[PDB]
Structure 1
Amino acid sequence: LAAGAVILRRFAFNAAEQLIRDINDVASQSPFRQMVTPGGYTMSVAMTNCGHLGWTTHRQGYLYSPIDPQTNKPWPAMPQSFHNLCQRAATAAGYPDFQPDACLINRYAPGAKLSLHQDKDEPDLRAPIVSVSLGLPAIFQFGGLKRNDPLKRLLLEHGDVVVWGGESRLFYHGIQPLKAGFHPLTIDCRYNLTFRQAGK
């Protein structure tokens, strides 16, 4: 896909059913919620987290916290299925020592989108981003270090895993408005699992 980035198409296909079962378990403790940006806007994507740290929004500035600001309780621990799939994907991508301490779970309803951004809330740039697609297909935008750099448009389907790091760790990326559709395992949405090393 780019220097230090690759797309493992259908890599998580066999694990998908189990991953989704665990998403449901995580959501039981920390429900999906549409976060409000530091700017005061409700995101179309619904999110939740598991692992030691969870990505969240604050009155002013994104940040990681071990506490779910909605439930006021710790985020659920990282499911075994998540941990194992993530490490296998990272190894295949060329990052064998990846040890994530956070997993952001995104749920896209039809029309939902995640505008172009950089994952720049993690201090240790040596750790890659492992992104798992589940359910409905979406168009993933992958660019460069500048918001105006040319964008690649790649369809991401159920089971696809994208890993980026090294030279492309801070590349801009996003998801275009989700097209309506149906998928036997997620029904009416697309889920995405984003593993990161947010601390240390």
Structure 2
Amino acid sequence: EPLAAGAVILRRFAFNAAEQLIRDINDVASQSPFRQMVTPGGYTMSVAMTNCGHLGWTTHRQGYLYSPIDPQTNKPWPAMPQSFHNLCQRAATAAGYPDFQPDACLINRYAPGAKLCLHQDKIHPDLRAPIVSVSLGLPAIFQFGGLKRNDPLKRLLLEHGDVVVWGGESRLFYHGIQPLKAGFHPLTIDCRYNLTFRQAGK
């Protein structure tokens, strides 16, 4: 059974690419470090984040923003690694979105206990562009709901190499990650990473 209208899970899709993806996460973060962002209301998120590409997701006192500049370094986010871009395009194509041109990649790092509460990915300049979401490392339980917060959730374990793609009818669906269990993975040791690809600009 597929995930939803316009949505699919490509299990272990990124497994072969994962070692290089992780090397390139480390390179990105060497330039724009992982940081735990603070919400407009003043709470520090448990997931640590950075970005690459032309636009990075950030919080600010005034809201959420896709920005061309990393507010911590005052420099552009690092260029999107070719490994990231190539994996993203292969996964998008396999999922039925062959024309996707991301300009933004949000890199999440989950330590044990870290979560991401149910939310919608908002800001869609192209209603035909999906979200491509790549899991690395330790396993996590992903929630995928509907257009309204109380719509029933599907709960899916996401393991190393899994890729989730949503878009079209499901582009604005609520989703999140449950608190990460401690464990070991040979390539990330003690964390999970996620890559979220978007077209956030015109």
Question: Same fold judged by TM-score > 0.5?
Answer: yes
The alignment yields a C-alpha RMSD, in angstroms, of 0.6
Secondary structure of the 1:47 match is strand
Deviation at 1:2, TM superposition (A): 0.3
In structure 1, distance between residues paired with 2:125 and 2:38: 23
Deviation at 1:126, TM superposition (A): 1.6
**Unmatched segments (≥5 aa) in structure 2:** none
Deviation at 1:79, TM superposition (A): 0.1
* Greater shift in the superposed pair: 114-123 or 134-143: 114-123
In structure 2, distance between residues paired with 1:56 and 1:122: 16
In structure 2, distance between residues paired with 1:16 and 1:129: 19
Deviations along 1:54-110, one digit per CA (max 9) or x if unpaired, are: 000010210111100001110000000000000000000000000000000000000
4+ runs deviating over 2 angstroms: 121-125
Structure-1-length-normalised TM-score: 0.99
Conserved? CA contact 1:7–1:163, under 8 Å: yes
Percent of pairs with identical residues: 99
In structure 2, distance between residues paired with 1:98 and 1:5: 14
Deviation at 1:125, TM superposition (A): 2.4
Match of 1:64 among 56, 63, 66: 66
**Unmatched segments (≥5 aa) in structure 1:** none
Conserved? CA contact 1:102–1:196, under 8 Å: yes
Secondary structure of the 1:195 match is strand
In structure 1, distance between residues paired with 2:126 and 2:71: 24
Deviations along 1:163-187, one digit per CA (max 9) or x if unpaired, are: 0001000000000000010000000
In structure 2, distance between residues paired with 1:128 and 1:121: 12
Deviation at 1:124, TM superposition (A): 2.4
Deviation at 1:5, TM superposition (A): 0.2
In structure 2, distance between residues paired with 1:137 and 1:93: 22
Conserved? CA contact 1:63–1:121, under 8 Å: no
Deviation at 1:38, TM superposition (A): 1.1
Deviation at 1:131, TM superposition (A): 0.1
Structure-2-length-normalised TM-score: 0.98
